[PDB]
Amino acid sequence: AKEKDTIRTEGVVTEALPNATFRVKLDSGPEILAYISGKMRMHYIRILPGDRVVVEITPYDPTRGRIVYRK
């Protein structure tokens, strides 16, 4: 079916976990371990804490975000 559902909200990069996973605190609030986007990985786009990044977030589990855009 492919559901259009996600929230394209931004956030501050709090902390770098392994893989390229980050606890990023959003515009609105809650910090979710957010993993980097595949696209980003492909174009080698690094992130460090102290950044403002676009983070696509799921309806099923609003706890695992996905860092979409290059900052």
Partner 1 sequence: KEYLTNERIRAKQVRVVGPDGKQLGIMDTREALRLAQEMDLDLVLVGPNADPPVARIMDYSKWRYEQQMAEKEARKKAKRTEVKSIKFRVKIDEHDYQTKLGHIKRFLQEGHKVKVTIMFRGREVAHPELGERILNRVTEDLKDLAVVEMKPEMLGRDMNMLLAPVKV
Nearer residue to partner 1 within complex by CB, 50 or 59: 50
Instruction: Cite the beta strand spans of 27-63 per DSSP E.
Output: 31-36, 52-57
Q: Hey, what amino acid is at 8?
A: R
CB of 54 to partner 1, least distance (A): 17
CB of 48 to partner 1, least distance (A): 5
Q: CB neighbours (10 Å) of residue 47? A: 17
CB of 45 to partner 1, least distance (A): 12
CA 33 from chain centre, in angstroms, equals: 8
**Interface ranges with partner 1 (CB under 8 A):** 15-16, 46, 48-51
